[PDB]
């Protein structure tokens, strides 16, 4: 599977960041992937036409893709994930379980807050839990992930103003 997965390329096969098709003409990815020059591999080969906040980045694609079975978008969930929920991180798929935020507070050198969630067991890629996108990929330490539920509106807004 993973029909929502996309690759951001630098000139010409310099693979570097992942992205997730959230709507048929829209990708979501992490902020540190802000290159002012990239191409998109979704298969189809596209170009950015708009890029955005300091936590995630929205990319508007030159073409709206017709939802297929090999390429289809994934909905961004408004329900925040609860500890114990099992999810999968792809970008080669690993299984993980949401943890308490204090596991990440106790282990990380910086402050952790609501806009992230804590998860782990045994960039720009997706964390899918109940079949919907709930996070983005930001030693034996738990991972921190962007809590997309707290951003569901900033994307909606950002889409209306670039549509």
């Amino acid at each position: 599977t993973q029909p929502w997965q996309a690759a951001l390329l630098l000139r010409p096969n310099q693979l570097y960041c992942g992205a997730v098709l959230v709507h048929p003409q829209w990708l979501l990815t992490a902020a540190h992937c802000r290159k002012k020059v990239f191409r998109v591999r979704l298969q189809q080969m596209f170009q950015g036409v708009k890029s955005i906040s300091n936590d995630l980045m929205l990319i508007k694609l030159n073409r709206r893709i017709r939802p297929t079975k090999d390429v289809r978008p994934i909905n961004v969930s408004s329900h925040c994930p609860s500890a114990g929920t099992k999810c999968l991180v792809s970008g080669q798929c690993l299984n993980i379980s949401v943890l308490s935020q204090k596991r990440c507070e106790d282990a990380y050198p910086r402050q952790i807050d609501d806009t992230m969630f804590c998860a782990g067991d045994k960039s720009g890629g997706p964390v899918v839990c109940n079949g919907s996108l709930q996070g983005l990929v930001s030693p034996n330490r738990p991972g921190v992930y962007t809590n997309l539920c707290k951003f569901t509106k900033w994307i909606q807004e950002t889409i209306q103003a670039n549509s």
Partner: antibody, heavy 120, light 111 residues
Framework: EVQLVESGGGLVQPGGSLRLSCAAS????????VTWVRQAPGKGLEWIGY????????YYASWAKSRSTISRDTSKNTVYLQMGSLRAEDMAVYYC?????????????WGQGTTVTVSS | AIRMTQSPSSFSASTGDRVTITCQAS??????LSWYQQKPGKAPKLLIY???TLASGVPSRFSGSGSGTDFTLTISSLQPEDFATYYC????????????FGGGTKVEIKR
Amino acid sequence: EVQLVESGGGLVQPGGSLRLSCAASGFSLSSYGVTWVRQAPGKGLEWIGYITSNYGVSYYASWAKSRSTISRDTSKNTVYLQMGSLRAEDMAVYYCARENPDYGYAYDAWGQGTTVTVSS
Amino acid sequence: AIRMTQSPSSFSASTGDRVTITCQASESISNELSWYQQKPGKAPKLLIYYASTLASGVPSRFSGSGSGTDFTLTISSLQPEDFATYYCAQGFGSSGVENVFGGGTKVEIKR
């Protein structure tokens, strides 16, 4: 034995500063975070904040962030609470307590409590 | 922004009775919930953690239940030395929190 011994609670005049020490014996601050909680006479438990075990990151109650600091001396295995601009509302018994991650960070070992009186 | 609330503020029952007191989280905290007993003039003591596992030395008449937002502490048979105030505390997250503790429930004994 795990033990948290507190010191530094006394009579402070209004607008003064409090400095409190929580000296940990029987365990290492690099393995256990420590919390500060206070209690006014006849009232409930009021969390002030805590400092993590690994990098010593401080988390504060929203009401406490602007005036409080929680810090760690790893060589003395001692945790500190500092507070300025003291008012009547800060008169309280101040406890420190250890967070045990195996019990999901529950507070399993408490200090004896040190009393801070804001008076002139 | 997790808020914890306890109910009732005051609980009176008779010796030997079953006692049930509640605690609620404004958002899900899974089972990261702990219960503390504070006898008069003493530091609080941990009774229950992970919502339902008894700490060493806690009398078996204590038990705790729940997961998510609604939690229960229970005393199967109220003994005199159970006179105290009971607090719950979430250990799910620390950011944007006013207080990790609930307001407490004072247990009073009718004899």
